[PDB]
RNA sequence: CGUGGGUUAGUCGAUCCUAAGAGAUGGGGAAGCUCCGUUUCAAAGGCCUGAUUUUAUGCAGGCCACCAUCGAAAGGGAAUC
RNA sequence: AAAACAUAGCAUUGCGAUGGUCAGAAAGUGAUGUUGACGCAAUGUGAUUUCUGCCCAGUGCUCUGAAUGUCAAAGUGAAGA
RNA sequence: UCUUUACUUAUUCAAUGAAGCGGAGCUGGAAUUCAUUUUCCACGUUCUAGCAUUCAAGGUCCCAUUCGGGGCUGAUCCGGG
């Protein structure tokens, strides 16, 4: 129950990873892939714009 | 230097969170600030009748400086000086005359040699009649940036008017030179100023709107 | 963790 | 003019003086409204109250209706020079308050009751 | 006589709207700098039923331009918008279903919905399920788009007034018969106390202009003047004509 | 004294001078609360003929009421 | 009928929270008893941290600003056998 | 306790918010409305099937219809001290 | 007398935590130096359910270098409608 989360140690409430007790493992994996790929495509977006100039 | 890097923010639409800018122009001020600002506006947007509009012209800074120079020589006795004078009980005093009822009475008797009228009296009807009256009685008058300034001349907070009836023979020529200057800007212009309506000034944005229709 | 608990730890160290 | 990063104007912080009165609010401070002699009105000496003295090591008092458990503990320690373990209280059907005061094991309720002088 | 049913409604006691389960008022974002000058992108996080309303709602999340935080709007979902879709709102947003454009910035023939009557009203026209407005013309001198409303009224609005591209979802709702009294009961349970309705002729004279008589009948014309007063306006108010419409109603 | 002139001016309520002051002031008063303390009399001549003096203990309030 | 005895809580309830709702204030109505409205066309507050070691207030900094309050002994809710 | 009311179904009417219907003594006031014509409001008929004729003189409702009939207060003209 | 139409400050409506209005620029783009600049158009975000906060890094100038601090610019100017 909500207030019982106050009595228990941090290992019961989390897991050892980015977004531990907040997002699931496959959700974190999609966030990482998407962050990596969109941030790369941004470098390509700018270069393609900078060539046309 | 090698550890440090240039990471410039893009504050275009839909990019970074905008930085803290000066929003003074947009502040929702307290109602009383709004009232006092909008009152100043409204009283220039409306066509202002001559008897009021004449108070827009005021004595220039150099002449005003020279006037206050003179009048400061005839400051009324302070509370301390009176306490001294009454132990002695003395010579004739020369002092700036003030009090709206007093001065109005002095002007009607042609005792005043120079009258100063504050430009910022509220309500205005305390002094709208004075230029006309001084003009009628042949009294030199100046409209001066004051109330508070004339206050200081007379050991008061404010004063509304101040006048000289007598000056010392030292400063007779000083007064006369000063009256000549003062007459040029007020009494000698009185009959022209009596005809000219003030106000009808547009705000910034409406002016621009008017200027863009003028050239077309 | 709640503010009241954070404040407790902060007092404990201030001694 | 000064820079204003918010478009909200708030009331300025302004000095707040403490009161410095020209005369006291009242002449004389009231004496303690609930001293020990007010907190403990009298012992309760029903046959069932007395059974608790003899057995449970519990004194049973009538007690001011304004008195809480902290004030009863403090009054009992003061008036009878005894150590209190716990206080249980109830408001009786006649509208007075009864306190069941258990002493610590070092004291005997029957001795102390004999001293205050109801057996 | 006594105060009739249609007059009791204005006091709004038992006749107020039943709003416990509603999601919030559907409204466009407040019209701000970004929307006036560029566009802002939001995400469709959820598409959700609103009690009382036919059309589903779309919870669209946008970043705040001036503070680090998110801002959930509640849009009425256009047919075809899906969870995860990005929505673009502003002067410069592209002409795709779900985007929010000023009506000046769209060609003649565009279908829009949740259109503002005045700029920044946050949405007014064509919000019920299956409805939309058609842009039919621009007047760029007067800065006025002309539009056809669901009713078939034509209307001139500011070209700065915004709309959403496409038709409100949940269309064809009123093609399924209700069949049972009970279905109408549950329909009106989430709206307001308007149902069931006693006919005025089944009442006594004290209760309604139509009441009374040794047969149920109206007894005077049922068409009532526009200048009639409260307590008299029952029947057909200010009717230009009456009887079965032999033809098409479109202009 | 001034107060004689003030008395006579205030009788000319459709003079251009007084029309203008009437317009500015009616606006300003409409902006404040329906009852509000006035700092000083707007008509000091009128106030004094009705009994006001400029002493500590005399107070002016301005109030509007609905017509009709 | 007369006279007495009898109800013991950190853990059970109330107390806290919000519901439909009720309702001050800012304001506006009303001759007025009062009416409207509940975040408004208001200058509407109160936290954090270090200290200073002067003292638990001004000072040092920062920080955020929504809008009283009442409304459940069956709703939500810290803890006992 | 019914053959009455409701009902789904059918049909009509009003209204695009500076709005319709309705509330309030008033209001910087309210309900519909957390609404927007697949909606809100006002009526009639009463599942399905089948059909729903003729009459716009009357009463009503309604009309970017003619005008010089009727026609208040204010205003205007003449007479008159 | 009517119809059409200007002005903005009264009055009226609406919105927001009163955040980017109005006028000039800068920058380009196209067009067109038709000698000459007159203008006109834009003036950082659109494969993707990621991320975006600490007076901003940078640049630059002062400070008295030190743990740092301050200004300017980055983010054009003007009018506080
Ligand atoms: K009902
Ligand atoms: K019915
Ligand atoms: K009838
Ligand atoms: K308890
Ligand atoms: K409870
Ligand atoms: K019918
Ligand atoms: K007929
Ligand atoms: K007829
Ligand atoms: Mg108890
Ligand atoms: Mg029906
Ligand atoms: Mg009957
Ligand atoms: Mg009747
Ligand atoms: Mg019958
Ligand atoms: Mg009738
Ligand atoms: Mg005073
Ligand atoms: Mg008994
Ligand atoms: Mg419990
Ligand atoms: Mg109330
Ligand atoms: Mg409560
Ligand atoms: Mg419970
Ligand atoms: Mg029976
Ligand atoms: Mg029936
Ligand atoms: Mg049938
Ligand atoms: Mg007449």
Which chain E residue has its CA at the smallest distance from B15's CA?
A: E65
How far is it, in rounded angstroms, from Cα E191 to Cα E53? 8
**Resolution (in Å) of the shown entry?**
2.4
Tokens of B154: 């007379």
**The dihedral of CA B125, B126, B131, B132: what is its sign?**
positive
The SS3 call for residue A38 is helix
How far is it, in rounded angstroms, from Cα E49 to Cα E55? 8
> Going along chain D, which residue ranges are E strands?
40-43, 58-63, 84-91, 97-103
Instruction: Count CB-CB contacts under 10 A for residue F45.
Output: 20
Strand B47-48 relative to strand D40-43: parallel, antiparallel, unpaired? unpaired
How far is it, in rounded angstroms, from Cα D60 to Cα D55? 12
The minimal CB distance from F5 to the residues B35, B42, B129 is found for B129
Burial E138-150 (b: 16+ CB within 10 A, else e): beeeeebbbbbeb
Which of D1, D2, D4 is the mutation pick for testing B, counting most B CBs within 10 A? D4
Distance between the alpha carbon (CA) of D10 and the C1' atom of G67, Å: 14
Q: Which residues pair with D103 in a beta bridge?
A: D84
Closest CA to B141 of B175, B171, B183, B95: B183
Nucleotide nearest to D9 (CA to C1'): G43
Helix F2-10 to helix B100-108 angle (10° resolution) is 90
Which of F2, F16, F33, F47 is the mutation pick for testing B, counting most B CBs within 10 A? F2
Looking at the C1' of nucleotide G21, which residue has the nearest alpha carbon? Answer: E13
How far is it, in rounded angstroms, from Cα E94 to Cα E112? 13
How far is it, in rounded angstroms, from Cα E62 to Cα D2? 33
CB within 8 Å of D118: residues ≥ 6 apart: D43, D45
> Half-sphere exposure of residue E236, counting CA atoms within 13 Å on the CB side?
10
Per the listing, tokens 């012209």 go with: B57
> Which technique?
cryo-EM
Please list every residue in chain B whose beta carbon sits closer than 8 Å to the beta carbon of residue E32: none
Give the ligand whose atoms come closest to the C-alpha of residue E210: 3
User: Does the beta-carbon distance from B20 to D5 stay under 8 Å?
Assistant: yes
CA distances E109 to E8, E76, E97, E133, E135, Å, are 44, 21, 14, 10, 5
What is the total residue count of chain C?
15
How far is it, in rounded angstroms, from Cα E28 to Cα E38? 16
Tokens of E70: 């998110």
Tokens of E34: 């970004």
How far is it, in rounded angstroms, from Cα B180 to Cα E248? 91
Please list every residue in chain B whose beta carbon sits closer than 8 Å to the beta carbon of residue E37: 13
Q: Is E169 exposed, middle or buried (0-12, 13-18, 19+ CB in 10 A)?
A: buried
Nearest-Cα distance to chain A for C1, in Å, is 8
Which chain B residue has its CA at the smallest distance from D9's CA?
A: B29
Nearest-Cα distance to chain C for A26, in Å, is 26
């Amino acid at each position: 129950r909500p207030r019982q989360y106050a009595t228990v140690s941090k290992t019961h409430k989390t897991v050892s990873r980015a977004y531990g007790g907040s997002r699931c493992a496959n959700c974190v994996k999609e966030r990482i892939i998407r962050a990596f790929l969109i941030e790369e495509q941004k470098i390509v977006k700018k270069v393609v714009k900078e060539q046309t100039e | 230097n090698p550890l440090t890097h240039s990471t410039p923010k893009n504050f275009g639409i839909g990019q970074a969170v905008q930085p803290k800018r000066n929003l003074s122009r947009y502040v929702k001020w307290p109602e009383y600030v709004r009232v006092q600002r909008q009152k100043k506006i409204l009283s220039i947007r409306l066509k202002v009748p001559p008897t009021i509009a004449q108070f827009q012209y005021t004595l220039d800074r150099n002449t005003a400086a020279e006037t206050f120079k003179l009048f400061n020589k005839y400051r009324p006795e302070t509370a301390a000086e009176k306490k001294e004078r009454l132990t002695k009980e003395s010579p004739k005093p020369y002092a700036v005359k003030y009090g709206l009822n007093h001065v109005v009475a002095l002007i009607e008797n042609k005792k005043a040699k120079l009258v100063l009228i504050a430009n910022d009296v509220d309500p205005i009807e305390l002094v709208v009649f004075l230029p006309a009256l001084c003009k009628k009685m042949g009294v030199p008058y100046a409209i001066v940036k004051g109330k508070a300034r004339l206050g200081t001349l007379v050991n008061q907070k404010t004063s509304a008017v101040a006048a000289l009836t007598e000056v010392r023979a030292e400063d007779e020529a000083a007064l006369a030179k000063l009256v000549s200057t003062i007459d040029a800007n007020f009494a000698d212009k009185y009959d022209e100023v009596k005809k000219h309506w003030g106000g009808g000034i547009l705000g910034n944005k409406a002016q621009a709107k008017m200027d863009k229709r003028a050239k077309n | 963790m709640r503010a009241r608990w954070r404040k407790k730890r902060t007092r404990r160290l201030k001694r | 003019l000064k820079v204003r990063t918010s478009a909200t104007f708030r009331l300025p912080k302004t000095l707040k003086l403490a009161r410095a009165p020209k005369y006291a609010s009242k002449a004389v401070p009231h004496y303690n409204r609930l001293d020990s002699y007010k907190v403990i009105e009298q012992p309760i000496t029903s046959e069932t109250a007395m059974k608790k003295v003899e057995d449970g090591n519990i004194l049973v008092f009538q007690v001011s209706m304004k008195a809480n458990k902290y004030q009863i503990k403090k009054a009992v320690k003061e008036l009878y020079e005894v150590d209190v373990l716990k206080v249980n209280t109830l408001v009786r059907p006649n509208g007075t308050k009864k306190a069941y005061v258990r002493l610590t094991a070092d004291y005997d309720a029957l001795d102390i009751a004999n001293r205050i002088g109801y057996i | 006589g006594r105060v009739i049913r249609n007059q009791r409604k204005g006091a709004g006691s038992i006749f107020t709207s039943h709003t416990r389960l509603r999601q919030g008022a559907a409204k466009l974002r407040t019209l701000d700098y970004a929307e006036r000058h560029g566009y802002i992108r939001g995400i469709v996080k959820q598409i959700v039923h609103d009690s009382g309303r036919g059309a589903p709602l779309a919870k669209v999340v946008f970043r705040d331009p001036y503070k680090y935080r998110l801002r959930e709007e509640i849009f009425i979902a256009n047919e075809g918008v899906h969870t995860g879709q990005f929505i673009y709102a502003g002067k410069k947003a592209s002409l795709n279903v779900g985007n929010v454009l000023p009506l000046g910035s769209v060609p003649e023939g565009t279908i829009v919905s949740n259109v503002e009557e005045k700029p920044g009203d946050r949405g007014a026209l064509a919000r019920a399920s299956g409805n939309y407005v058609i842009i039919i013309g621009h007047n760029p001198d007067e800065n006025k788009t002309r539009v056809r409303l669901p009713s078939g009224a034509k209307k001139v609005i500011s070209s700065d007034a915004r709309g959403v591209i496409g038709v409100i979802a949940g269309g064809g709702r009123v093609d399924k018969p209700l069949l049972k009294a009970g279905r109408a009961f549950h329909k009106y349970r989430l709206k307001r106390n308007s149902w069931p309705k006693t006919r005025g002729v089944a009442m006594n004279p004290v209760d309604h202009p139509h009441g009374g008589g040794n047969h149920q009948h109206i007894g005077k014309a049922s068409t009532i003047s526009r200048g009639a007063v409260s307590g008299q306006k029952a029947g057909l108010i200010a009717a230009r004509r009456t009887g079965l419409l032999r033809g098409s109603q479109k202009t | 004294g001034a107060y004689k002139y003030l008395e006579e001016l205030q009788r000319k309520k459709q003079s251009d001078v007084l029309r203008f002051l009437q317009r500015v002031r009616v606006w300003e008063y409409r902006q404040k609360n329906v009852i509000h303390r006035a700092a000083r009399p707007t008509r000091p001549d009128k106030a004094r003929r009705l009994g006001y003096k400029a002493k500590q203990g005399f107070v002016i309030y301005r109030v509007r009421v609905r017509r009709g």
